[PDB]
Amino acid sequence: LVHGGPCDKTSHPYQAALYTSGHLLCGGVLIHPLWVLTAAHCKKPNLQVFLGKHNLGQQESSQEQSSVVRAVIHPDYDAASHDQDIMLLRLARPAKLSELIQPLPLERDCSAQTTSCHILGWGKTADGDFPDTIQCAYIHLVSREECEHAYPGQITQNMLCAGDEKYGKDSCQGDSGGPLVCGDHLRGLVSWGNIPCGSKEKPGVYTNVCRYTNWIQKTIQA
Numbered sequence: 001l002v003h004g005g006p007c008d009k010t011s012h013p014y015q016a017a018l019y020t021s022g023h024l025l026c027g028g029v030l031i032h033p034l035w036v037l038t039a040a041h042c043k044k045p046n047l048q049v050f051l052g053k054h055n056l057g058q059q060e061s062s063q064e065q066s067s068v069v070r071a072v073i074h075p076d077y078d079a080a081s082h083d084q085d086i087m088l089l090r091l092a093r094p095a096k097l098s099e100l101i102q103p104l105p106l107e108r109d110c111s112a113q114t115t116s117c118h119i120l121g122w123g124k125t126a127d128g129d130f131p132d133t134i135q136c137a138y139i140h141l142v143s144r145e146e147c148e149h150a151y152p153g154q155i156t157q158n159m160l161c162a163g164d165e166k167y168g169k170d171s172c173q174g175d176s177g178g179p180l181v182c183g184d185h186l187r188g189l190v191s192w193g194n195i196p197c198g199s200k201e202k203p204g205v206y207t208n209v210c211r212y213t214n215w216i217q218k219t220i221q222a
């Protein structure tokens, strides 16, 4: 995350850190004690999910670790265009809920009214380095027309755009799969964007979670 600041310790109980080969790969969101929501391009071998983390470099009393028993990618995911970039992860051990581990409710209404949005993650910072402490930033949703002018013919209905006009606060490398939180509800997932990271003119592109409510529900209860 570029141009942000460390989060408050108790403000991110839904955040998951995804690891492969012993190294941080992606972000994720706890949506049920048995399920984590992330991006389909985060599909790597033998995925390790860590809940209740704040500082990656330190061992914390609040943290829980689980391996993945089932990885469910959306049937219509197209890797080249990033369309329908969503994946469900079944935990081997269901999450032991606490003050620092809780699920986040999803946004069901695609025509949901204006709320305050924020992004969070352990992705690359402004200096080009990986932080130990999780980063946070407030951003605003960018109109569909404004986004189609930034990325001609690359924006589908399964994507949302968001950014910060003043500083260019944006998600970055290592944030993929993380949440776009609008009004205490999951509104989107980190999918793709401008490299080098910065949202002043080309906003970040996120998976539009409101479109996948029925698919998410059918997968969990399958």
Ligand SMILES: N=C(N)c1ccc(NC(=O)[C@H]2CCCNC2=O)cc1
Pocket: 025, 026, 041, 042, 123, 170, 171, 172, 173, 174, 175, 176, 190, 191, 192, 193, 194, 195, 196, 197, 198, 203, 204, 205
């Ligand atoms: N500028 C942006 N908004 C933005 C958002 C996400 C990325 N994603 C990555 O680089 C990927 C690579 C594959 C695994 N993990 C990642 O995070 C880039 C830019």
